[PDB]
Design a protein around this ligand. Structure first.
Ligand SMILES: [Zn+2]
Ligand SMILES: [Zn+2]
Ligand SMILES: [Zn+2]
Ligand SMILES: [Zn+2]
Ligand SMILES: [Zn+2]
Lengths: 275, 249, 267, 256, 258
């Protein structure tokens, strides 16, 4: 039951021994817009319950969302000193609400949650990341050979139609998508003629994106064999954290690329510049 | 479009009434040659147009590209009345003696559709190819003939029939027997050394040549091209020059 | 030909506008708007037939009053479209109770007899009189058949059918399966059909001569408006239909004649 | 497909409809009736139309306007429900029989002279008096064909209900049209044709009464004899230029 | 407007007062010079707007799309009040230039989308004139009825049904008559000072329009003030699928040769 998992995650988050509430303080900072990246460490979960550690290590896709939702639920009860920001997204939302009186959780989200590899986990070479570790948590190491410039990536789209006033939503969970052509709002359906809605870039959500290629250390590579590469996707605060020619060790998720045989990429979670 | 009709009538009157010192119509003698084959373009001096009617000359300069077809239609009637010629024979107007010299840099989107005059050095030419001016499109569902379908620098076909029955989507066969073909050439010229500003490369442009004004200017010849500026096709667009007269000084 | 002139798009639009203006603005002797009341009575009783008097049409539009008796098909189609537009403007919700408003022409100045109809009257709006002798039952007839394509399962558009020939299918967009074409019974549109037979009046027939007879076709609202043994005044389009059986019988190529009824008045 | 969803909705209607209040008690009405009829040997049920509307208004509205496919789906759902209610059948009766569904409603009846051409392929309710009938002939439902030359067999072909045939294939897959129907490999049902006459009072003055051809099938045969007043519920359908004969596929009879 | 704190009247009055109350009314003196110069534009430094009203400066920076036209209206009105007799070819175009670059070519986070920024670099390559359609000419092909539709968010609507004969698929775009404007593409590199240790220079695409065309040349180290724009990109020309990552470009507002 995923609900029980979420309750267990919340119970861990609210009460953490150190009894310094590291998670509580950090969630309060996030509610105060003082912190964006929250890195959950798995050794603490091992201290409480190692079964959850094994379960989260087997599939680091659902439990990331579970942790994000738990943090989102815990956030409201820590907003003490209101806000001191001037977000354009918040201005757009405020004016839209004012007109409304006259929402996906990801849309109302600015915290990114990442996990840290437990001390038990050991680093692996690029050649050692086989097909039996798809969807699991891995820790590769190597030399970065190429880094791309940071570009915005659409996360959720926010369309507006001239005929109606209800803004349309379109989450983007794929590398490619097709923009909405006709407005599906019930106001337009009643009119029997869908409006030619347009995407409002001001009300949309964008995230920093970066792509880098990690190679293999020459000494570790066998003499006969040639070195192999790997593509790593970096999003969020982890961007601008690596430069070409740097020895790094990356903890992330091994996933295939879909667009029966497929390519693979690494979803980075924690980047460390080892030597 | 009463502007085009008035321009056509005034141009026809100018053709049949212009008289110099001799008090004789030069354009009638010009159409005498248009009677013969291998001749399809007439000549006219813009200064004499101003002399006859400066207002008409200004109106021509305003929308030269827009009113050029009507000028051609008027000269067609003039030539046909002067002498016996096939009706299908098309005619064109070449405008000469245009004092409003321009600059290659001066060209912009505002000047599109107005008669201009530019100078340059010919870089390269292209072989002569036929060009489809107006095509004949036939519906495949009712066999209705839709003639005089103009081509706007692209293969363009309508979606309606001549008769009010069909509305065909994309099935419109083209007949070359009822079509109109004109000579086409595509030359390239570059900015002359005198025009060359300091620290700037020559902005080479392309020139479209038609009618008897084909294979007229050889490579590396300083020539003055008189013609309009048009846009040749998110909507991709690029600039091009359509010269009606080519002269060498 | 008047047909060619009225087939012009600009002429069609002009006639449409003139008829709309006539329907909207036609005062009576006392200034009352007659067509407002007529449309109110038609929609009040859930009818789909609007009568138009030829006299006032001639009084307000002589050009159309001359065009109509020479091209009664397209002119009546334009009249139907204009009447539908006017009714929809007056009663926005009448698209539920009806789908097509018909125009019936009354008091046509020309009157003929069944014994004096020749090829001069072909494809013209004529007005005769007589006594009904036969009335078949109401049978369904194909109005707009929707042919399908077995090669793609896509169904072709509507194809109008006339009372003179058998409609044939068109062309599928890309998969040209002309042969495997059929008809579905749930998207096709039908219409009522009834073929009456009229004959000359008992009193008006010449003593030396014998009574004559002609066939008439009734569709849509016109059905069940006559009973055998009734004196009627029939207005319709005189129409020519080929009949090879008569050709073989007489030994000479001959064609049958029928009347497409438009307005029927019982005296 | 949407057909599966419609069939599932019909099955849910059959399995879940209940009548009564909690002050007395609840009894499933159509599942019990299906079980009782199947055990008695009568393979039919009488489904009302207000009940189906109360359960699901959309389902009732899709039966008043496209009766053919929706009635076929309803009959298949009835067969599946009847199979599941009496699942452990005695030896020799493992195979499940087909169920025929009859419809009934309390709407005001129409007239024969009020049947327009717009109401084609729609459920109609017309009264009248029966004046004729025919002998009970046979109508095929499942046929099997065989080639005359290469004796290839294509079995279990389904024939649409009503006065509608089956166009035999041309290519043998052996000259053109090499297929003949195997006589013994055919399943047939009863078949009758009646003639309904307009009621003696609805006839206008100075006019003879009109008629209409009816079609009866399976358990509806031999239910009405000439001279009976009936109220017929059926599907208006079609069997000169473009003229087609029109009959009424009867799906319910209420003898008065 | 929607989701925007701009107010045309309030901002216009604030701009007028700021021009009048610019004691450092120097901008009024600049308008006086323009009265004889005859070039309808006004170069304005941002810091003066900050000093007058940091709130108005914040509104200008956050939403430069609509604030700048309001400033244009206010400047034109005050210029007309001071010099009604003055004749100009067109309306005044205020360019809120910035003295120094807020950010380098790097650190251009997506938060800066649709906001005014200033950068510096060296011009490398300049493209030729690219005409752009502004007002579309749709002409009927059934009754030959002419229209003069204009631009609206860049998605020009094409009415299939004519306004005179009421026939579908009758309007046709005769682009040879539609209105056009000018564009230019400029590639700008990164200065060595902004370049970190052992890093190759980057490049940024700049789009110049109207008068700004042919104002910069290759080999010139200039500072650029413009708007940070992000546009979607389709996967294929025929296919309409759009990649998640959006390419970015700068619409220039002011050029400083420096
Ligand atoms: Zn909408
Ligand atoms: Zn056609
Ligand atoms: Zn097909
Ligand atoms: Zn065979
Ligand atoms: Zn039109």
């Amino acid at each position: 039951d995923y609900q029980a998992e979420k309750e267990k995650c919340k119970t861990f988050l609210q009460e953490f021994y150190k009894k310094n509430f590291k998670y509580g303080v950090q969630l309060a900072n996030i509610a105060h817009r003082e912190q964006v990246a929250l890195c959950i460490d798995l050794d603490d979960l091992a201290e409480e319950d190692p079964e959850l550690v094994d379960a989260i290590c087997e599939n680091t896709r659902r439990y990331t969302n579970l942790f994000a939702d738990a943090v989102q639920e815990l956030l409201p009860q820590y907003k003490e000193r209101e806000v001191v920001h001037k977000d354009a997204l918040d201005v757009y939302i405020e004016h839209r609400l004012m007109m409304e009186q006259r929402y996906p959780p990801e849309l109302m989200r600015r915290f990114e949650l990442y996990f840290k590899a437990p001390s038990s986990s050991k680093a692996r070479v690029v050649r050692d990341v086989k097909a039996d570790s798809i969807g699991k948590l891995v820790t590769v190491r190597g030399i970065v050979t190429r880094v791309t410039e940071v570009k915005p990536m659409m996360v959720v789209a926010t369309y507006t139609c001239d005929q109606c006033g209800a803004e349309t939503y379109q989450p983007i969970q794929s590398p490619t998508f097709m923009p909405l052509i006709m407005c599906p709002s019930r106001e337009c359906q009643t009119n029997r003629s869908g409006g030619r809605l347009y995407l409002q870039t001001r009300g949309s959500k964008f995230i920093k994106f970066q792509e880098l290629k990690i190679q293999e250390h020459s000494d570790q590579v066998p003499v006969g064999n040639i070195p192999r590469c790997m593509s790593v996707y970096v999003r969020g605060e982890n961007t601008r954290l690596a430069q070409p020619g740097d020895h790094v060790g990356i903890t992330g998720v091994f996933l295939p690329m879909l667009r029966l045989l497929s390519e693979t990429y690494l979803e980075s979670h924690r980047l460390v510049k080892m030597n | 479009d009463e502007l085009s009709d008035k321009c056509q009538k005034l141009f026809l009157e100018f053709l049949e009434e212009c008289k110099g010192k001799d008090g004789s119509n030069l354009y009638v003698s010009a159409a005498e040659e248009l009677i013969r084959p291998e001749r399809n373009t007439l000549a006219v001096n813009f200064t004499d147009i101003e002399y006859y009617n400066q207002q008409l000359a200004t109106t021509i300069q305003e929308e030269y590209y827009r009113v050029y077809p009507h000028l051609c239609r008027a000269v067609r009637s003039f030539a046909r009345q002067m002498g016996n010629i096939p009706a299908n024979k098309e005619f064109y107007i070449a405008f000469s003696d245009f004092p409003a010299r321009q600059k290659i840099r001066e060209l912009s989107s505002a000047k599109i559709g107005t008669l201009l005059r530019i100078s340059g050095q010919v870089v390269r030419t292209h072989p002569v190819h036929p060009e489809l001016v107006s095509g004949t499109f036939l519906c495949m569902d009712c066999q209705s003939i839709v003639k005089d379908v103009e081509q706007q620098f692209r293969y363009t076909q309508p979606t309606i029939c001549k008769n009010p029955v069909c509305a065909n989507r994309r099935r419109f066969t083209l007949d070359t027997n009822k079509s109109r073909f004109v000579d086409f050439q595509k030359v390239r010229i570059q900015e002359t050394q005198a025009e060359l500003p300091r620290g700037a490369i020559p902005r080479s442009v392309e020139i479209i040549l038609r009618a008897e004004a084909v294979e007229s200017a050889m490579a590396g010849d300083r020539c003055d091209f008189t013609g309009t500026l048009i846009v040749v096709p998110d909507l991709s667009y690029r600039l091009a020059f359509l010269a009606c007269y080519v002269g060498a000084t | 030909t008047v047909r060619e002139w009225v087939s012009m798009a600009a002429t069609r639009l002009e006639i449409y506008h003139r008829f709309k203006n006539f329907l909207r603005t036609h005062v009576d002797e006392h200034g009352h708007n007659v067509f407002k009341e007529k449309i109110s009575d038609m929609c009040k009783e859930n009818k789909e037939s609007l009568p138009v008097n030829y006299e006032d049409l001639a009084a307000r539009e002589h050009v159309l009053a001359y065009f109509l008796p020479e091209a009664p098909a397209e002119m009546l189609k334009i009249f139907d479209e204009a009447a539908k537009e006017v009714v929809l403007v007056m009663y926005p919700k009448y698209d539920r109770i009806a789908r097509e408003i018909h125009v019936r022409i009354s008091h046509l100045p020309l009157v003929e007899e069944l014994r004096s109809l020749r090829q001069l009257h072909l494809n013209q709006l004529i007005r005769t009189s007589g006594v009904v002798t036969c009335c078949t039952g109401v049978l369904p007839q194909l109005s707009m058949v929707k042919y399908n394509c077995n090669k793609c399962n896509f169904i072709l558009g509507p194809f109008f059918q006339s009372q003179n020939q058998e409609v044939r299918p068109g062309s599928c967009p890309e998969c040209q399966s002309f042969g495997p074409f059929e008809i579905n019974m749930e998207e096709t549109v039908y219409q009522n059909y009834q073929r009456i037979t009229i004959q000359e009046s008992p009193g008006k027939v010449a003593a030396g001569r014998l009574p004559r007879s002609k066939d008439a076709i009734l569709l849509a609202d016109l059905v069940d408006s006559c009973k055998p043994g009734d004196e009627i005044e029939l207005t319709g389009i005189y129409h020519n239909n080929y009949d090879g059986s008569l050709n073989t019988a007489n030994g000479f190529p001959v064609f049958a004649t029928v009347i497409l009824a438009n307005h029927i008045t019982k005296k | 497909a949407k057909k599966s969803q419609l069939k599932k909705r019909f099955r849910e209607f059959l399995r879940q409809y209940r009548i009564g209040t909690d002050r007395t008690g609840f009894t499933f009405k159509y599942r019990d009736e299906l079980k009782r009829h199947y055990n008695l040997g009568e393979y039919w049920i009488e489904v009302e139309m207000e009940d189906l509307a109360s359960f699901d208004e959309d389902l009732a509205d899709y039966l008043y306007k496209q009766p053919t496919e929706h009635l076929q789906l309803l009959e298949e759902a009835a067969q599946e429900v009847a199979d599941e209610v009496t699942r452990p059948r005695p030896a020799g009766e493992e195979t499940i029989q087909e169920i025929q569904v009859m419809l009934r409603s309390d709407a005001n009846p129409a007239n024969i002279r009020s049947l327009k051409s717009e109401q084609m392929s729609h459920l109609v309710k017309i009264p009248g008096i029966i004046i004729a009938a025919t002998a009970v002939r046979a109508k095929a439902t499942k046929i099997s064909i065989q080639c005359r030359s290469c004796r290839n067999t294509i079995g279990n072909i389904a024939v649409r209900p009503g006065l509608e045939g089956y166009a035999m294939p041309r290519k043998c897959n052996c000259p053109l049209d090499p297929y003949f129907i195997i006589p013994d490999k055919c399943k047939c049902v009863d078949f009758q044709t009646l003639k309904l006459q307009e009621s003696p009072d609805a006839v206008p003055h100075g006019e003879l009464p009109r008629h209409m051809q009816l079609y009866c099938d399976r358990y509806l045969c031999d239910k009405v004899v000439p001279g009976n007043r009936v109220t017929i519920m059926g599907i208006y359908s079609i069997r000169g230029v473009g003229i087609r004969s029109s009959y009424i596929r009867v799906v319910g009879i209420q003898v008065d | 407007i929607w989701g925007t704190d701009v107010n045309v009247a309030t901002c216009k009055e604030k701009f007028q007062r700021f021009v009048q109350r610019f004691i450092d009314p120097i901008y009024m003196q600049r308008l006086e010079e323009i009265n004889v110069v005859g070039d309808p534009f006004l170069n304005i430094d941002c810091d003066h707007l900050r000093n007058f009203d940091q709130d108005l400066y914040r509104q200008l920076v956050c939403y430069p799309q609509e604030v700048i036209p309001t400033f244009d209206m206010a400047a034109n009105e005050i210029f007309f009040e001071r010099y009604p007799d003055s004749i100009l070819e067109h309306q005044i175009q205020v360019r809120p230039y910035n003295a120094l670059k807020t950010r380098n070519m790097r650190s251009l986070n997506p938060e800066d989308i649709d906001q005014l920024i200033t950068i510096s670099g060296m011009v490398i390559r300049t493209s030729q004139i690219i005409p752009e359609m502004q007002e579309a000419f749709f002409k009927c092909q059934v009754c030959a009825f002419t229209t003069r539709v204009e631009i609206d968010r860049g998605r020009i609507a094409e009415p299939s049904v004519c306004k005179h004969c009421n026939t579908t698929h009758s309007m046709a775009l005769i682009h040879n008559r539609s209105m056009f404007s000018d564009k230019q593409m400029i590639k700008l590199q990164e200065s060595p000072e902004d370049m970190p240790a052992g890093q190759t220079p980057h490049t940024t695409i700049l789009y110049g329009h109207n008068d700004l065309v042919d104002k910069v040349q290759p080999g010139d180290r200039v500072n650029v003030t413009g708007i940070y724009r992000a546009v979607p990109i389709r996967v294929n020309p025929r296919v309409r699928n759009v990649k998640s990552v959006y390419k970015t470009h700068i619409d220039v507002i002011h050029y400083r040769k420096t």
